[PDB]
Amino acid sequence: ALPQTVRIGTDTTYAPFSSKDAKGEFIGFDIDLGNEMCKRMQVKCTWVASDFDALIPSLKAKKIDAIISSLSITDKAQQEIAFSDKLYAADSRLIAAKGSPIQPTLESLKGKHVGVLQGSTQEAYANDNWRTKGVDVVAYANQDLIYSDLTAGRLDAALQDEVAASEGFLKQPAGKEYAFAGPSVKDKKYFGDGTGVGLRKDDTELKAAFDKALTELRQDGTYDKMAKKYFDFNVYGD
Ligand SMILES: N[C@@H](Cc1c[nH]c[nH+]1)C(=O)O
């Protein structure tokens, strides 16, 4: 009943969770989690690269069978799809040039150019709260474009998952002159409760299989071993 091949869509521009190494192989914590779960589910899995905003449509169209792409578990998303249990926690946070006075507030951001990933919870938040009120919110096909436009000085700030910005950019050579601008942006309704495997609502069996795999690799400590490759903190949360 489970497919012998589970097709998993991911947006490979979100290090350290999902990206590509120099020879084009998919790498990162999402990939590690996905591969470990598939192993324990005893299914073959095929990774499929996609822009983030195409993931849920591809899933609904059955071009893929699952999404592992730091996809936040939100009220809004669950109207369209189902989710596995939580894979890890994910807060949102602004980044900007080091020394910048920028804060995640309308007062600070009005007339500023702020980059967000198209289709993301950050785009939802920024469009509702900031774009309406005169912040130049700029939506991008992928997160790599955002970092590029930031370093080029075309953007004043960018909003994205906190850990991705930190491990994927700030702690990298390209992000040396950048820092977080203000604390995490906390908003329960927009940003959801951690990330999970996104699935078609009727695929209850595939969800059960992922959930079971996830519980097992967390219990035996495999989760923590894989996570320590990327993180010196508790990425899972509570
Ligand atoms: N986790 C957020 C932001 C994100 C973009 N890509 C991966 N994560 C979301 O689900 O929209």
PDB file of C-alpha atoms and ligand atoms in Angstrom:
ATOM      1  CA  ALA A   1       0.000   0.000   0.000  1.00  0.00           C
ATOM      2  CA  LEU A   2       2.939   2.289   0.727  1.00  0.00           C
ATOM      3  CA  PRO A   3       4.647   3.214  -2.542  1.00  0.00           C
ATOM      4  CA  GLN A   4       7.831   1.218  -3.117  1.00  0.00           C
ATOM      5  CA  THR A   5       9.162   4.618  -4.168  1.00  0.00           C
ATOM      6  CA  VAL A   6       8.289   7.688  -2.077  1.00  0.00           C
ATOM      7  CA  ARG A   7       8.963  10.920  -3.975  1.00  0.00           C
ATOM      8  CA  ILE A   8      10.082  13.707  -1.609  1.00  0.00           C
ATOM      9  CA  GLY A   9      10.101  17.300  -2.776  1.00  0.00           C
ATOM     10  CA  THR A  10      12.513  19.796  -1.254  1.00  0.00           C
ATOM     11  CA  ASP A  11      13.806  23.306  -1.933  1.00  0.00           C
ATOM     12  CA  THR A  12      17.577  22.962  -1.980  1.00  0.00           C
ATOM     13  CA  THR A  13      18.402  26.576  -1.112  1.00  0.00           C
ATOM     14  CA  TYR A  14      17.953  26.433   2.670  1.00  0.00           C
ATOM     15  CA  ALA A  15      21.216  25.306   4.326  1.00  0.00           C
ATOM     16  CA  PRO A  16      21.859  23.635   6.700  1.00  0.00           C
ATOM     17  CA  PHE A  17      18.528  21.840   6.237  1.00  0.00           C
ATOM     18  CA  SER A  18      18.377  21.310   2.483  1.00  0.00           C
ATOM     19  CA  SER A  19      21.010  22.275  -0.079  1.00  0.00           C
ATOM     20  CA  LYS A  20      23.349  20.891  -2.754  1.00  0.00           C
ATOM     21  CA  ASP A  21      27.020  20.014  -2.443  1.00  0.00           C
ATOM     22  CA  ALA A  22      29.542  20.726  -5.178  1.00  0.00           C
ATOM     23  CA  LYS A  23      28.562  17.711  -7.270  1.00  0.00           C
ATOM     24  CA  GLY A  24      24.840  18.372  -6.991  1.00  0.00           C
ATOM     25  CA  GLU A  25      23.972  15.820  -4.311  1.00  0.00           C
ATOM     26  CA  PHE A  26      21.272  16.842  -1.822  1.00  0.00           C
ATOM     27  CA  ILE A  27      22.670  17.526   1.671  1.00  0.00           C
ATOM     28  CA  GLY A  28      21.500  18.792   5.068  1.00  0.00           C
ATOM     29  CA  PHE A  29      19.460  17.921   8.142  1.00  0.00           C
ATOM     30  CA  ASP A  30      16.154  17.543   6.185  1.00  0.00           C
ATOM     31  CA  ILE A  31      17.889  15.116   3.828  1.00  0.00           C
ATOM     32  CA  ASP A  32      19.413  13.170   6.705  1.00  0.00           C
ATOM     33  CA  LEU A  33      16.024  12.941   8.432  1.00  0.00           C
ATOM     34  CA  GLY A  34      14.246  11.955   5.233  1.00  0.00           C
ATOM     35  CA  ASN A  35      16.809   9.300   4.329  1.00  0.00           C
ATOM     36  CA  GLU A  36      16.832   7.837   7.839  1.00  0.00           C
ATOM     37  CA  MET A  37      13.055   7.721   7.980  1.00  0.00           C
ATOM     38  CA  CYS A  38      12.865   6.074   4.536  1.00  0.00           C
ATOM     39  CA  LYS A  39      15.418   3.487   5.608  1.00  0.00           C
ATOM     40  CA  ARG A  40      13.337   2.543   8.650  1.00  0.00           C
ATOM     41  CA  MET A  41      10.119   2.589   6.609  1.00  0.00           C
ATOM     42  CA  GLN A  42      11.912   0.203   4.238  1.00  0.00           C
ATOM     43  CA  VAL A  43      10.899   2.199   1.175  1.00  0.00           C
ATOM     44  CA  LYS A  44      13.020   3.613  -1.637  1.00  0.00           C
ATOM     45  CA  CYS A  45      12.928   7.403  -1.769  1.00  0.00           C
ATOM     46  CA  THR A  46      13.588   9.815  -4.591  1.00  0.00           C
ATOM     47  CA  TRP A  47      14.493  13.379  -3.798  1.00  0.00           C
ATOM     48  CA  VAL A  48      12.997  16.011  -6.109  1.00  0.00           C
ATOM     49  CA  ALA A  49      14.291  19.608  -6.180  1.00  0.00           C
ATOM     50  CA  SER A  50      11.662  22.341  -6.431  1.00  0.00           C
ATOM     51  CA  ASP A  51      11.211  26.048  -5.683  1.00  0.00           C
ATOM     52  CA  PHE A  52       9.483  26.283  -2.310  1.00  0.00           C
ATOM     53  CA  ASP A  53       6.289  27.796  -3.674  1.00  0.00           C
ATOM     54  CA  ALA A  54       5.825  24.814  -6.026  1.00  0.00           C
ATOM     55  CA  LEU A  55       5.989  22.192  -3.265  1.00  0.00           C
ATOM     56  CA  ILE A  56       2.438  22.113  -2.008  1.00  0.00           C
ATOM     57  CA  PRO A  57       1.014  22.373  -5.555  1.00  0.00           C
ATOM     58  CA  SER A  58       3.255  19.486  -6.715  1.00  0.00           C
ATOM     59  CA  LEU A  59       2.117  17.472  -3.715  1.00  0.00           C
ATOM     60  CA  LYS A  60      -1.565  18.094  -4.453  1.00  0.00           C
ATOM     61  CA  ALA A  61      -0.954  17.164  -8.111  1.00  0.00           C
ATOM     62  CA  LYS A  62       0.821  13.948  -7.008  1.00  0.00           C
ATOM     63  CA  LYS A  63       4.086  14.855  -8.790  1.00  0.00           C
ATOM     64  CA  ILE A  64       5.644  14.194  -5.371  1.00  0.00           C
ATOM     65  CA  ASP A  65       4.409  12.190  -2.360  1.00  0.00           C
ATOM     66  CA  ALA A  66       5.942  14.133   0.493  1.00  0.00           C
ATOM     67  CA  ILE A  67       7.599  17.432   1.370  1.00  0.00           C
ATOM     68  CA  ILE A  68      10.601  17.753   3.641  1.00  0.00           C
ATOM     69  CA  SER A  69      11.707  21.326   3.281  1.00  0.00           C
ATOM     70  CA  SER A  70      11.572  23.034   6.691  1.00  0.00           C
ATOM     71  CA  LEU A  71       7.801  23.178   6.063  1.00  0.00           C
ATOM     72  CA  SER A  72       6.126  24.783   9.103  1.00  0.00           C
ATOM     73  CA  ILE A  73       3.105  23.094  10.676  1.00  0.00           C
ATOM     74  CA  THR A  74       0.537  25.893  10.520  1.00  0.00           C
ATOM     75  CA  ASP A  75      -3.254  26.183  10.793  1.00  0.00           C
ATOM     76  CA  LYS A  76      -3.304  27.515   7.258  1.00  0.00           C
ATOM     77  CA  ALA A  77      -1.203  24.712   5.767  1.00  0.00           C
ATOM     78  CA  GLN A  78      -3.325  22.036   7.468  1.00  0.00           C
ATOM     79  CA  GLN A  79      -6.376  23.268   5.581  1.00  0.00           C
ATOM     80  CA  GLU A  80      -4.637  21.965   2.435  1.00  0.00           C
ATOM     81  CA  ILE A  81      -2.361  19.113   3.548  1.00  0.00           C
ATOM     82  CA  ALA A  82      -1.497  16.828   6.471  1.00  0.00           C
ATOM     83  CA  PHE A  83       1.733  16.735   8.485  1.00  0.00           C
ATOM     84  CA  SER A  84       3.924  14.200  10.221  1.00  0.00           C
ATOM     85  CA  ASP A  85       4.833  14.802  13.845  1.00  0.00           C
ATOM     86  CA  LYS A  86       7.321  17.625  14.450  1.00  0.00           C
ATOM     87  CA  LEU A  87      10.791  17.209  12.878  1.00  0.00           C
ATOM     88  CA  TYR A  88      12.288  20.286  14.569  1.00  0.00           C
ATOM     89  CA  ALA A  89      11.382  23.756  15.828  1.00  0.00           C
ATOM     90  CA  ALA A  90      11.731  26.837  13.620  1.00  0.00           C
ATOM     91  CA  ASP A  91      11.512  30.499  14.672  1.00  0.00           C
ATOM     92  CA  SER A  92      11.658  33.452  12.251  1.00  0.00           C
ATOM     93  CA  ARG A  93      14.146  36.290  12.617  1.00  0.00           C
ATOM     94  CA  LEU A  94      15.365  39.362  10.708  1.00  0.00           C
ATOM     95  CA  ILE A  95      18.943  39.723   9.487  1.00  0.00           C
ATOM     96  CA  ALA A  96      20.643  42.913   8.332  1.00  0.00           C
ATOM     97  CA  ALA A  97      24.088  44.529   8.081  1.00  0.00           C
ATOM     98  CA  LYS A  98      26.114  44.383  11.298  1.00  0.00           C
ATOM     99  CA  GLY A  99      25.544  47.534  13.299  1.00  0.00           C
ATOM    100  CA  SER A 100      22.184  48.173  11.659  1.00  0.00           C
ATOM    101  CA  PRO A 101      19.527  49.731  13.904  1.00  0.00           C
ATOM    102  CA  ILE A 102      16.864  47.737  12.042  1.00  0.00           C
ATOM    103  CA  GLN A 103      14.212  46.097  14.221  1.00  0.00           C
ATOM    104  CA  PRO A 104      11.323  43.846  13.165  1.00  0.00           C
ATOM    105  CA  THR A 105       8.879  46.758  13.467  1.00  0.00           C
ATOM    106  CA  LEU A 106       6.846  48.848  11.081  1.00  0.00           C
ATOM    107  CA  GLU A 107       8.450  52.006  12.466  1.00  0.00           C
ATOM    108  CA  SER A 108      11.936  50.720  11.675  1.00  0.00           C
ATOM    109  CA  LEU A 109      11.157  49.026   8.351  1.00  0.00           C
ATOM    110  CA  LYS A 110       8.951  51.608   6.601  1.00  0.00           C
ATOM    111  CA  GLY A 111      10.536  52.483   3.266  1.00  0.00           C
ATOM    112  CA  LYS A 112      13.092  49.666   3.731  1.00  0.00           C
ATOM    113  CA  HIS A 113      13.591  46.838   1.249  1.00  0.00           C
ATOM    114  CA  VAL A 114      12.922  43.514   2.969  1.00  0.00           C
ATOM    115  CA  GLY A 115      13.426  40.143   1.290  1.00  0.00           C
ATOM    116  CA  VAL A 116      11.231  37.083   1.914  1.00  0.00           C
ATOM    117  CA  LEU A 117      10.894  33.639   0.308  1.00  0.00           C
ATOM    118  CA  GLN A 118       7.890  33.441  -2.023  1.00  0.00           C
ATOM    119  CA  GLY A 119       5.202  31.122  -0.608  1.00  0.00           C
ATOM    120  CA  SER A 120       6.701  31.088   2.893  1.00  0.00           C
ATOM    121  CA  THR A 121       5.142  31.930   6.257  1.00  0.00           C
ATOM    122  CA  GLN A 122       7.565  34.861   6.343  1.00  0.00           C
ATOM    123  CA  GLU A 123       6.059  36.206   3.121  1.00  0.00           C
ATOM    124  CA  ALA A 124       2.578  35.806   4.643  1.00  0.00           C
ATOM    125  CA  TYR A 125       3.621  37.710   7.765  1.00  0.00           C
ATOM    126  CA  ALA A 126       5.512  40.442   5.903  1.00  0.00           C
ATOM    127  CA  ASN A 127       2.785  40.962   3.325  1.00  0.00           C
ATOM    128  CA  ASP A 128       0.052  41.328   5.924  1.00  0.00           C
ATOM    129  CA  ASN A 129       1.961  43.375   8.499  1.00  0.00           C
ATOM    130  CA  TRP A 130       4.548  45.319   6.528  1.00  0.00           C
ATOM    131  CA  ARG A 131       3.843  45.464   2.777  1.00  0.00           C
ATOM    132  CA  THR A 132       0.383  46.924   3.393  1.00  0.00           C
ATOM    133  CA  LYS A 133       1.899  49.704   5.480  1.00  0.00           C
ATOM    134  CA  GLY A 134       4.666  50.869   3.157  1.00  0.00           C
ATOM    135  CA  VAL A 135       7.499  48.445   3.732  1.00  0.00           C
ATOM    136  CA  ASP A 136       8.993  47.383   0.422  1.00  0.00           C
ATOM    137  CA  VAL A 137       8.554  43.631   0.879  1.00  0.00           C
ATOM    138  CA  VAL A 138      10.277  41.808  -1.984  1.00  0.00           C
ATOM    139  CA  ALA A 139       9.393  38.152  -2.622  1.00  0.00           C
ATOM    140  CA  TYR A 140      12.003  35.808  -4.055  1.00  0.00           C
ATOM    141  CA  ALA A 141      11.871  32.454  -5.863  1.00  0.00           C
ATOM    142  CA  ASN A 142      14.549  31.112  -3.510  1.00  0.00           C
ATOM    143  CA  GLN A 143      16.580  31.972  -0.378  1.00  0.00           C
ATOM    144  CA  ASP A 144      19.902  32.027  -2.226  1.00  0.00           C
ATOM    145  CA  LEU A 145      18.651  35.002  -4.284  1.00  0.00           C
ATOM    146  CA  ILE A 146      17.763  36.765  -1.021  1.00  0.00           C
ATOM    147  CA  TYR A 147      21.225  36.396   0.535  1.00  0.00           C
ATOM    148  CA  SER A 148      22.751  37.535  -2.777  1.00  0.00           C
ATOM    149  CA  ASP A 149      20.611  40.664  -3.002  1.00  0.00           C
ATOM    150  CA  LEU A 150      21.378  41.434   0.678  1.00  0.00           C
ATOM    151  CA  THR A 151      25.168  41.275   0.246  1.00  0.00           C
ATOM    152  CA  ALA A 152      24.795  43.313  -2.946  1.00  0.00           C
ATOM    153  CA  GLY A 153      23.069  46.015  -0.909  1.00  0.00           C
ATOM    154  CA  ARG A 154      19.773  45.805  -2.792  1.00  0.00           C
ATOM    155  CA  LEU A 155      18.030  44.670   0.376  1.00  0.00           C
ATOM    156  CA  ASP A 156      18.138  46.301   3.803  1.00  0.00           C
ATOM    157  CA  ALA A 157      16.962  43.163   5.613  1.00  0.00           C
ATOM    158  CA  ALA A 158      15.621  39.666   5.121  1.00  0.00           C
ATOM    159  CA  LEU A 159      13.166  37.518   7.089  1.00  0.00           C
ATOM    160  CA  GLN A 160      13.527  33.718   7.163  1.00  0.00           C
ATOM    161  CA  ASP A 161      13.906  30.803   9.597  1.00  0.00           C
ATOM    162  CA  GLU A 162      16.365  31.717  12.347  1.00  0.00           C
ATOM    163  CA  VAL A 163      18.533  28.629  12.284  1.00  0.00           C
ATOM    164  CA  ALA A 164      18.812  28.676   8.482  1.00  0.00           C
ATOM    165  CA  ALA A 165      20.023  32.296   8.535  1.00  0.00           C
ATOM    166  CA  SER A 166      22.453  31.562  11.352  1.00  0.00           C
ATOM    167  CA  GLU A 167      24.008  28.297  10.177  1.00  0.00           C
ATOM    168  CA  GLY A 168      23.466  28.874   6.454  1.00  0.00           C
ATOM    169  CA  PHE A 169      24.689  32.461   6.182  1.00  0.00           C
ATOM    170  CA  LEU A 170      25.760  34.401   9.302  1.00  0.00           C
ATOM    171  CA  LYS A 171      28.328  31.780  10.327  1.00  0.00           C
ATOM    172  CA  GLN A 172      29.569  31.502   6.728  1.00  0.00           C
ATOM    173  CA  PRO A 173      32.127  33.771   4.985  1.00  0.00           C
ATOM    174  CA  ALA A 174      29.380  35.484   2.965  1.00  0.00           C
ATOM    175  CA  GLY A 175      27.521  36.535   6.134  1.00  0.00           C
ATOM    176  CA  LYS A 176      30.482  37.836   8.139  1.00  0.00           C
ATOM    177  CA  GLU A 177      29.361  41.479   8.008  1.00  0.00           C
ATOM    178  CA  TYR A 178      25.759  40.598   8.862  1.00  0.00           C
ATOM    179  CA  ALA A 179      23.835  39.908  12.071  1.00  0.00           C
ATOM    180  CA  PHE A 180      20.351  39.276  13.429  1.00  0.00           C
ATOM    181  CA  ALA A 181      18.313  42.473  13.668  1.00  0.00           C
ATOM    182  CA  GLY A 182      16.263  42.221  16.834  1.00  0.00           C
ATOM    183  CA  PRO A 183      14.981  39.040  18.533  1.00  0.00           C
ATOM    184  CA  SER A 184      12.932  36.197  17.039  1.00  0.00           C
ATOM    185  CA  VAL A 185       9.626  37.269  15.556  1.00  0.00           C
ATOM    186  CA  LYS A 186       7.039  35.358  17.552  1.00  0.00           C
ATOM    187  CA  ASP A 187       3.564  35.070  16.083  1.00  0.00           C
ATOM    188  CA  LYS A 188       1.756  31.801  16.728  1.00  0.00           C
ATOM    189  CA  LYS A 189      -0.739  32.094  13.911  1.00  0.00           C
ATOM    190  CA  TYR A 190       1.722  32.804  11.068  1.00  0.00           C
ATOM    191  CA  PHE A 191       4.762  30.725  11.937  1.00  0.00           C
ATOM    192  CA  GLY A 192       3.209  27.480  13.191  1.00  0.00           C
ATOM    193  CA  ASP A 193       4.689  24.878  15.541  1.00  0.00           C
ATOM    194  CA  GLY A 194       7.917  23.447  14.175  1.00  0.00           C
ATOM    195  CA  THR A 195       8.311  21.768  10.781  1.00  0.00           C
ATOM    196  CA  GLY A 196       7.036  18.379   9.602  1.00  0.00           C
ATOM    197  CA  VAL A 197       6.718  16.098   6.586  1.00  0.00           C
ATOM    198  CA  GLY A 198       3.957  17.537   4.374  1.00  0.00           C
ATOM    199  CA  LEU A 199       1.586  14.881   2.993  1.00  0.00           C
ATOM    200  CA  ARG A 200      -1.706  14.524   1.117  1.00  0.00           C
ATOM    201  CA  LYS A 201      -4.561  14.393   3.680  1.00  0.00           C
ATOM    202  CA  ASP A 202      -5.763  11.006   2.466  1.00  0.00           C
ATOM    203  CA  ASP A 203      -2.303   9.378   2.794  1.00  0.00           C
ATOM    204  CA  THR A 204      -2.903   8.257   6.361  1.00  0.00           C
ATOM    205  CA  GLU A 205      -0.766   5.133   5.940  1.00  0.00           C
ATOM    206  CA  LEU A 206       2.256   7.063   4.637  1.00  0.00           C
ATOM    207  CA  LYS A 207       1.848   9.513   7.528  1.00  0.00           C
ATOM    208  CA  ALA A 208       1.714   6.628  10.032  1.00  0.00           C
ATOM    209  CA  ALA A 209       4.875   5.149   8.540  1.00  0.00           C
ATOM    210  CA  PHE A 210       6.788   8.462   8.735  1.00  0.00           C
ATOM    211  CA  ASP A 211       5.550   9.131  12.272  1.00  0.00           C
ATOM    212  CA  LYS A 212       6.616   5.653  13.393  1.00  0.00           C
ATOM    213  CA  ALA A 213      10.059   6.011  11.796  1.00  0.00           C
ATOM    214  CA  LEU A 214      10.472   9.417  13.390  1.00  0.00           C
ATOM    215  CA  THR A 215       9.591   8.194  16.859  1.00  0.00           C
ATOM    216  CA  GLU A 216      12.010   5.290  16.530  1.00  0.00           C
ATOM    217  CA  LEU A 217      15.019   7.308  15.368  1.00  0.00           C
ATOM    218  CA  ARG A 218      14.369   9.881  18.076  1.00  0.00           C
ATOM    219  CA  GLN A 219      14.085   7.198  20.757  1.00  0.00           C
ATOM    220  CA  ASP A 220      17.292   5.323  19.945  1.00  0.00           C
ATOM    221  CA  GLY A 221      19.248   8.602  19.805  1.00  0.00           C
ATOM    222  CA  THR A 222      19.845   8.656  16.052  1.00  0.00           C
ATOM    223  CA  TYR A 223      18.105  12.050  15.840  1.00  0.00           C
ATOM    224  CA  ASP A 224      20.611  13.605  18.228  1.00  0.00           C
ATOM    225  CA  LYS A 225      23.587  12.043  16.477  1.00  0.00           C
ATOM    226  CA  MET A 226      22.491  13.383  13.091  1.00  0.00           C
ATOM    227  CA  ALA A 227      21.642  16.799  14.562  1.00  0.00           C
ATOM    228  CA  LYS A 228      25.030  17.229  16.233  1.00  0.00           C
ATOM    229  CA  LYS A 229      26.534  17.251  12.731  1.00  0.00           C
ATOM    230  CA  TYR A 230      24.969  20.688  12.235  1.00  0.00           C
ATOM    231  CA  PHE A 231      23.933  22.092  15.609  1.00  0.00           C
ATOM    232  CA  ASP A 232      25.440  22.682  19.062  1.00  0.00           C
ATOM    233  CA  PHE A 233      21.962  23.270  20.506  1.00  0.00           C
ATOM    234  CA  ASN A 234      18.594  21.516  20.836  1.00  0.00           C
ATOM    235  CA  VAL A 235      17.107  22.104  17.389  1.00  0.00           C
ATOM    236  CA  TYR A 236      14.047  19.977  18.184  1.00  0.00           C
ATOM    237  CA  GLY A 237      12.703  22.319  20.861  1.00  0.00           C
ATOM    238  CA  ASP A 238      10.021  21.209  23.327  1.00  0.00           C
TER     239      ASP A 238
HETATM  240  N1  LIG B   1       9.412  27.283   7.673  1.00  0.00           N
HETATM  241  C1  LIG B   1       8.837  28.401   6.927  1.00  0.00           C
HETATM  242  C2  LIG B   1       9.939  29.103   6.122  1.00  0.00           C
HETATM  243  C3  LIG B   1      10.618  28.239   5.105  1.00  0.00           C
HETATM  244  C4  LIG B   1      10.903  28.470   3.803  1.00  0.00           C
HETATM  245  N2  LIG B   1      11.578  27.368   3.333  1.00  0.00           N
HETATM  246  C5  LIG B   1      11.717  26.502   4.315  1.00  0.00           C
HETATM  247  N3  LIG B   1      11.166  27.014   5.403  1.00  0.00           N
HETATM  248  C6  LIG B   1       7.666  27.962   6.036  1.00  0.00           C
HETATM  249  O1  LIG B   1       7.157  26.851   6.198  1.00  0.00           O
HETATM  250  O2  LIG B   1       7.159  28.691   5.167  1.00  0.00           O
END
